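P.,

For your records, the input lines for the assembly:
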Amino acid sequence: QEDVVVTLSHQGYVKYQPLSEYEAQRRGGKGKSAARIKEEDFIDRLLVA
DNA sequence: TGGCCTGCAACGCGGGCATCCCGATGCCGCCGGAAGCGAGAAGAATCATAAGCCGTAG
DNA sequence: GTACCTACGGCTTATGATTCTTCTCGCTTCCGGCGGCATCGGGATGCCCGCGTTGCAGGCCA
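Structure tokens returned:
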């Protein structure tokens, strides 16, 4: 099974990681220190299968 | 340990109100294209019909 | 001295036939596509003040 989530970035990077690790990394608030970068990358598409 | 949310205070701009100009649009009439799947034809998966050898018997 | 046939049963290997599935054509008609006009709801601008926005400092969070 290996329940994972597939996240596609805006620059075209595709990858997946298990749902447990994804929920563990999701814990906490996103720091605006990285948001000050106008050339960063963000998630474009998300799906769980 | 570094950074983020929020309270307090000061500043500014747009929401609301109306209307004049404006842009879509519903309707009417004339013209275009695609769908319509039904049917013909081809390719492929599956089913049907022979042997080869395993070892004692003739 | 020196080889040559099938019967009893199970799994494969080689080849043709059959039906399922899919590729491709059929013109036509109906649903739609498109041009034009009166209409009706909408956007922007004039104006004000009060709420939205923002600077600064404090306490809390990852």
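Two observations worth noting. The two ends of chain A are 9 Å apart (CA to CA). Residues 29, 31-33 of chain A lie near DNA strand B (CB under 10 Å from a C1').

Regards
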